[PDB]
Amino acid sequence: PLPALKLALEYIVPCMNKHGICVVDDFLGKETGQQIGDEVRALHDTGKFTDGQLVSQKSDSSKDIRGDKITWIEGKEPGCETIGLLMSSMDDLIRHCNGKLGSYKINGRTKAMVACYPGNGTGYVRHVDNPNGDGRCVTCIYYLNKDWDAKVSGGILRIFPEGKAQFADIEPKFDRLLFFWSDRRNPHEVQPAYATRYAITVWYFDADERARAKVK
Ligand SMILES: O=C(O)CNC(=O)c1nc(Cl)c2ccccc2c1O
Ligand SMILES: O=C(O)CNC(=O)c1nc(Cl)c2ccccc2c1O
Ligand SMILES: [Fe+2]
Fold first, then answer.
1. Ligand 1 within 6 A of 136 CB?
2. Where is Fe cation annotated to bind?
3. For the domain that residue 147 is a member of, what is the CATH number?
4. Which range marks the domain in which residue 156 is found?
5. Binding-site residues, please?
6. Handedness of CA 1, 98, 17, 206 (dihedral sign)
7. Residue 210 phi/psi, 5° resolution?
8. How many domains does the chain have?
9. What string of DSSP letters covers 162-180?
10. Which of 38, 63, 66, 184 is the most exposed place for a label (fewest CB within 10 A)?
11. Using a 6 Å cutoff on CB, does residue 115 contact ligand 2?
């Protein structure tokens, strides 16, 4: 459903409230997805990303292993127009969920974090996005890896939902949109990536949790 409204009301709200996780495929379409892919790859090739999260040292600094590289995008930067549009689509979508996602009242968003795992076997250890109540209630991730083959490239996002035995494996599939509670209900990890892996994350703020963040 293109109008975010039907998708938000008939799928996203119900899914988030029952599962705390929601997967939406073919969110923007091939044409738009590829345009974002192209903008993200230009950022990388023009050196706009960091050098990567320091994974290992071992006192010889050229034997230092670095992982995910990142860059923060506000949405208006020249050359990042399609990303700004993606961001606007996530926003319109969240706006349609107002008063429906838990008992939260979203009133803000972080800038978009574009992450690129180099594909050198690095990943992201199990973690909780917001474990100390910093205001972030919902994590939103947009994937842009065409023909991703987890069986050969790894890089699967594994979420250990609620506090129930199983976990949920989600492939960083092209044009896929993902939503999940940012707090302790969703510990998760990015398994080792053996191929270049791109994703765009945005975190939405709950009005109350954020307002008291400096005093909690
Ligand atoms: O930029 C601002 O208005 C103040 N920033 C924040 O409130 C803020 N808080 C958090 Cl927890 C994050 C967390 C990640 C990235 C950006 C953040 C951010 O801008
Ligand atoms: O990309 C994915 O499928 C899942 N990614 C994450 O869970 C993730 N989380 C955090 Cl908090 C960061 C934080 C910084 C850079 C990358 C991150 C990341 O990829
Ligand atoms: Fe995360």
1. yes
2. 127, 129, 188
3. 2.60.120.620
4. 1-216
5. 127, 129, 188, 197
6. positive
7. -70, -40
8. 1
9. TT-SS-EEE--BTTEEEEE
10. 63
11. yes
Cα–Cα distances in Å, from 45 out to 40, 50, 86, 137, 142? 9, 12, 21, 33, 20
DSSP 51-81: S--EEE--S-TTS-EE--EEEEE-S-STT-H
Q: Indicate the DSSP class of residue 149.
A: -
Centre of ligand 3 to C-alpha 194, Å, is 19
Strand arrangement of the beta sheet that strand 168-170 belongs to: 124-127, 188-190, 157-159, 168-170
Exposed e or buried b per residue across 200-216, where buried means at least 16 C-beta atoms within 10 angstroms of its C-beta? bbbbbbbeebbeeeeee
Q: CB neighbours (10 Å) of residue 177?
A: 22
Binding-site residue numbers for 2-oxoglutarate are 197
What is the amino acid identity at position 204?
A: Y
How many A from CA of 196 to the centre of ligand 2? 14
Question: Structure solved using which method?
Answer: X-ray
Nearest CA to ligand 1 atom 2: 110
93: nearest Cα among 32, 203, 6 = 6
The C-alpha angle 179, 185, 189, rounded to 5 degrees, equals 70
To what resolution in angstroms was this structure determined?
Answer: 2.0
Crossing angle, helix 30-45 and helix 81-95, to 10 degrees?
130
Which of 134, 190, 191, 200 best tests ligand 2's pocket when mutated (most atoms within 8 Å of CB)? Answer: 190
* Rounded CA separation 216/18 (Å): 28
Nearest CA to 40 out of 76, 74, 88, 82 is that of 82
Residue written as token pair 């972030």? 136
